[PDB]
Homo-oligomer: A and B are copies of this chain.
């Protein structure tokens, strides 16, 4: 129907086709910085004090195209940073401030991100000045952090290092094709996974209550659940809301239908800005953002205990903003004129959101916030910790945090591991340990499977998971179904621990090896063995330095979200997946940061290596198991085999030869490689007569990539 330059493509003819473009997000060709650019090296040299002073100058210098409430952009920047981090969700680790995605579609145009187009624009002078040394990603959340400090709140600390991207991360935000739409609930009030907001285009909850019903008790149910899905418990949630609403104000001075198109739908002359309003001046005193007109505190540009003092110091009744939005105001005309106007007008009455009232109406929040009414030093502590968590939740390993403001204190939510406390294994010890593991009696399948299980727990969205920590032997990973706890896992763990004990006791010097490094090294040693069995003498690369986490360092509930409900690389498909197995394969590959060729070699290799869940024969298209051949690709392309869905409709297929005898069995994941025209092209590379050496090389490179995914300690 359309030109490709206007978005036309093959999805128009086959709407539900597998989208392999999820495996080439942020292509190098789109990146203007060049091959040698290293943001970490750039931002490590930034003048943080000068940056802070420059941001402070921006916050207190009102611009005429978006005048600053109370002459201070601080609170606007706090909402900006909070919204940047607030898209994060635990189910897939996507969203968050990590890539500065708020500057791009669709997030830059979400109803809830109204006016943040101007907020980000205000900071161009800072980005202009610091250039390569400062990403928009870092700047957006640092501006929030500076705002807090500028207004009297001492933060816990700050880590730089968020890398800017050049195209939007494509994320599933829900099925609704209407802004603020809601088709994401089933049962009593079960919110659709992986979502963490109650309506399309909201950060968490509706500020007017569920579906616009301003019931604070019902609103709190939504607040609790959505914040839970963004890694915040009851104390953290309460801390963040009171901490945030200690500052600034909402904007709803006139009717919302006088507000123009969002940035992505706006005319060219608006230069990336949207929501142009025809109500009065359209800015400042006349500003409309949410459509609500609330100023929570008498000190909108100062940290103090005013929020809770006001919340508990008045009784509240339902009222309407100038734009017709529900909000609460103090009963009986109490506190008239006590709240300051953003541009020097007459004083105003106390006001709160329905969601603010949840904090005193909900029994759990009420106990927390009444305590803080009486002991505000506890609020300051909890808010510091929660805000720190909020703006860093998706940053991954602490090795990634850069700059002079990084606090010394490690935190449980960072999934910490011990520091390296001894000398690392060298070339000779690595060779020795590989030999010892091959002599241990552990099979190639066992070693490869275990190393895969450990390393493939990583997801590139929030950079959580991976083989560092040795968490495969700890809860919950040791009990995950896909890791098959009733199988050989505990035997493999025990054997590797015995080798660790032996090596550490036996070897003098100061060299010690971690269980974590041994899990990975076992996989590498087995792949070497299997490659030789296929007539290839290769060494699989290995980088030592992983350390062993304790159970105490491993939050079992937090780690729960990392459990695969599907892993096509092990031909595992559990219940509850939103899409057929082949789609879940690409999703898994996306999270592992794999390209299509990398995904392809890994599937083919792991199948013939025996890495399958429960050592099932599905996709094991070889006569020589435990040997690293390209047999999977050769057999998949064999026209002497006729494929048919299994008589038992179990998601499997039978591959029959000319006599009608079943030679192979496969899953949807297996067959998609021969059926999908773009994947088949890749299979035809690795299935050619000249391809075995290349396959082995590419498999080993891809394997090494997966083993090293969380290794920011050596990067």
Write the residues of chain A forming the contact surface with B, with a CB cutoff of 8 angstroms.
Answer: 1-24, 27-33, 63, 65, 103-106, 108-109, 121, 124, 127-133, 136, 164, 166-168, 170-172, 175-177, 263-272, 578-579, 583, 586-587, 590, 595-597, 600, 637, 639, 643-645, 653, 668, 671-672, 674-678, 680-682, 684-691, 698
Q: Name the distance in Å between A115's Cβ and chain B's nearest Cβ.
A: 15
Q: Is the CB of A19 within 8 A of B4?
A: yes
Among the listed B164, B677, B686, B691, which residue makes an inter-chain contact with A105, where contact means beta carbons less than 8 Å apart? B677
**List of B residues within 8 angstroms of A171 by Cβ:** 4
Q: Which residues of B contact A104 (CB under 8 A)?
A: 677-678, 681
Q: Which B residues are CB-close (under 8 A) to A133?
A: 690
The listed residue (B6, B28, B170, B268) touching A28 by CB distance below 8 A is B28
Alpha-carbon distance between A14 and B172 when the two chains are bound, in angstroms: 16
**A691 contacts which of B28, B29, B131 (Cβ < 8 Å)?**
B131
Contacts of A267 in B (CB 8 A): 675
Cβ–Cβ contact B3 & A7, under 8 A:
no
- Asked whether A32 lies within 8 Å of B600 as measured between CB atoms, the reply is yes
| Least distance between A593 CB and chain B CB atoms (Å) | 10
Identical copies of this chain, number: 2
Interface contact B124-A20, CB-CB below 8 Å: no
Q: Is the pair B20, A671 in contact by a Cβ cutoff of 8 Å?
A: no
Assess the B590–A5 pair: CB atoms within 8 A. yes
> Is the Cβ of A685 less than 8 Å from the Cβ of B32?
yes
Bound CA span A7–B419, Å: 43
| Residues A698 and B32 in contact, CB atoms below 8 Å apart | yes
A37: nearest residue on chain B (CB-CB)?
B694
Min CB distance A294 to B, Å, is 29
List 15 additional contacts besides A12-B177, A128-B637; criterion CB under 8 Å: A1-B177, A2-B172, A3-B587, A4-B172, A5-B586, A13-B109, A24-B27, A29-B597, A32-B698, A108-B677, A127-B688, A131-B689, A167-B678, A269-B643, A272-B674
Task: From known contacts A121-B639, A132-B688, A263-B677, infer whether A5 and B28 are also in contact, taking CB-CB under 8 Å.
Answer: no
Residues of chain B within 8 A (CB-CB) of A698 are 32
Bound-state CA distance A14–B264 (Å) is: 7
Q: Is A105 a contact of B14 with CB atoms below 8 Å?
A: yes
Looking at the assembled complex, report how far the CB atom of A485 sits from the nearest CB atom of chain B, in whole angstroms. Answer: 29
Closest chain-B Cβ to A290's Cβ sits at a distance in Å of 20
**B269 and A105: CB pair below 8 A?**
no
| Contacting residues, chain B, for A170 (C-beta < 8 A) | 4, 8-10
Residues of chain B contacted by A268 (CB below 8 angstroms): 643, 653, 668, 671-672, 675
**Best-buried of A4, A175, A597 by chain B (most CB within 10 Å):** A4
The winner among A170, A270, A586, A675 for most chain B CB atoms within 10 A is A675
Is A671 in contact with B106, judged by CB distance below 8 angstroms? Answer: no
Smallest CB separation, A630 vs chain B (Å): 11
Q: Are B32 and A5 in contact (CB under 8 A)?
A: no
Q: Are A689 and B175 in contact (CB under 8 A)?
A: no
In the complex, what residues of B have CB within 8 A of residue A16's CB?
2, 6-7
Q: Give the shortest distance, in Å, between A276 (CB) and chain B (any CB).
A: 12
**B639 and A128 contact, CB distance less than 8 A:** no
Tell me the nearest residue of chain B to A118, going by C-beta: B639
From the candidates B7, B103, B177, B596, name the one contacting A19 in the complex (CB within 8 A). Answer: B7
- A510, chain B: closest CB distance, angstroms: 40
Task: Assess whether A5 is in contact with B19, with CB atoms less than 8 Å apart.
Answer: yes
Inter-chain contact B269/A644, CB cutoff 8 Å: yes
For the complex of A and B, the 8 pairs showing the least CB-CB separation, nearest first, are A131-B688, A32-B597, A131-B690, A4-B170, A27-B27, A269-B643, A7-B11, A10-B105
Q: Using Cβ atoms and an 8 Å threshold, which residues of chain B touch A172? A: 2-4, 8
A639 touches B4 (CB 8 A): no
